[PDB]
C-alpha cells in the first residue's frame, strides 16, 4: 500500500473524438434498418 509507480493518464484529442463519433453514427445508420427489420 503506497503510491503505485505505474501511473499514467489517458488522452484523446479532438480529431480522435470526431473519428469515434463518426464511426458510431455511421455504424448506427448502417445497422438500424437491419435491426428494426
Amino acid at each position: 500500500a503506497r503510491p503505485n509507480p505505474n501511473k499514467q493518464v489517458v488522452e484523446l484529442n479532438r480529431t480522435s473524438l470526431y473519428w469515434g463519433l463518426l464511426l458510431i453514427f455511421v455504424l448506427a445508420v448502417l445497422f438500424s434498418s437491419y435491426i428494426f427489420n
Binding site: 479532438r14 480529431t15 470526431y18 453514427f25 455511421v26 448506427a28 445508420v29 428494426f36
Partner: peptide, 27 residues
C-alpha cells in the same frame, strides 16, 4: 416513427461532418 429515427441519425451524421469541417483544432 422509423422514418423519424432514420432522419435523426442522418442529420446527426451531417452535423458531425459539419463540426469536424468548421470546428477543427488548430495545428
Amino acid at each position: 416513427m422509423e422514418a423519424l429515427v432514420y432522419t435523426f441519425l442522418l442529420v446527426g451524421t451531417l452535423g458531425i461532418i459539419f463540426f469536424s469541417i468548421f470546428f477543427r483544432d488548430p495545428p
